[PDB]
Amino acid sequence: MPLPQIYVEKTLALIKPDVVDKEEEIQDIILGSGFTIIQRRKLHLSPEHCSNFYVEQYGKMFFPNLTAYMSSGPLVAMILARHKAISYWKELMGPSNSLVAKETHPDSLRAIYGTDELRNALHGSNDFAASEREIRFMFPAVIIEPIPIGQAAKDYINLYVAPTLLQGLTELCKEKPPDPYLWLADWLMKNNPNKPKLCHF
């Protein structure tokens, strides 16, 4: 961070199916406030997706209405980014509970568009690490974080990748197959420890 490099702060920002119809006004206020939108995408989270998206807090937020309000129609997620992105987005939002924001923050977007505690118009990152977690969930294959140049990449590989890759390459060495990449890649697909074995018969 005190590198030669210079830094962009990024935050997730959602609109629920009872507010998606007013996507355009919300995006207008977002752009006018000084944010820059990196990517749009239209979602429709099934309850399995809802259980995984709040997985940091789904073990405490036992709200079936909260799953329905993500599943009862499409969503509009965005990456927003500007100078102090998360705090400025929080300032526009206000309190997370819209029932408090309606009376105490007239300027809040949640007061303007939201309805109540669970029918909150907007959801976004409440923390930078939470920002990386939710953005890596919802929009795969988008670089958002500092790159782990040093030992952190080695730890990542040794904890996730190496315990499978070592053993697969070891069997590839026993067989010595032709065009070895098929053997490695099909082996990794078939015997992934993080997934079940699929028998297409």
Partner 1 sequence: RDIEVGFLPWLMNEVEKSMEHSMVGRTVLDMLIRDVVERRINDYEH
Partner 2 sequence: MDTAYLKNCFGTGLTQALAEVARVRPSDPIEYLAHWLYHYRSITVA
Partner 3 sequence: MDADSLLLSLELASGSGQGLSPDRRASLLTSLMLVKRDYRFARVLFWGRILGLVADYYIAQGLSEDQLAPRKTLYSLNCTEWSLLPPATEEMAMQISVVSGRFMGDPSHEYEHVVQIKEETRLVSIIDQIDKAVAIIPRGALFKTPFGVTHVNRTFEGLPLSEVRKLSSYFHFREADFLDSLEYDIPRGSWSIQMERGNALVVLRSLLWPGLTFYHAPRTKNYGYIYVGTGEKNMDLPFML
**Which sequence positions are flagged as catalytic?**
123
Identify the residue among 181, 196, 197, 201 touching partner 2 (CB under 8 A). Answer: 181
Centroid of chain to Cα 150: 25
Task: Give the interface segment with partner 1, choosing from 58-66, 150-158, 175-183, 191-199 (CB under 8 A).
Answer: 150-158
User: Which CB, 6 or 198, lies closer to partner 1?
Assistant: 6
Contact call for residues 81 and 31 (beta carbons, < 8 A): no
Beta strands in 46-183 (DSSP E): 75-81, 122-124
Among residues 73, 87, 82, 81, the alpha carbon closest in space to that of 17 is found at: 73
Please choose which of partner 1, partner 2, partner 3, none residue 27 contacts, taking the beta carbon within 5 to 8 angstroms, the exact cut-off set by kind. Answer: partner 3
Instruction: Tell me the C-alpha distance between 120 and 192, whole Å.
Output: 39
DSSP code of residue 28: H
- Cβ atoms of 84 and 8 closer than 8 Å: no
| Residue ranges that bind partner 1, judged by CB under 8 A | 4-6, 147-150, 153-154, 157, 162, 165-166, 169-170, 173
Contacts with partner 2 by CB under 8 A lie at: 136-137, 140-141, 143, 145, 147-148, 153, 156-157, 160-161, 164-165, 169, 172-173, 176, 180-181, 184-186, 188-189, 192-195
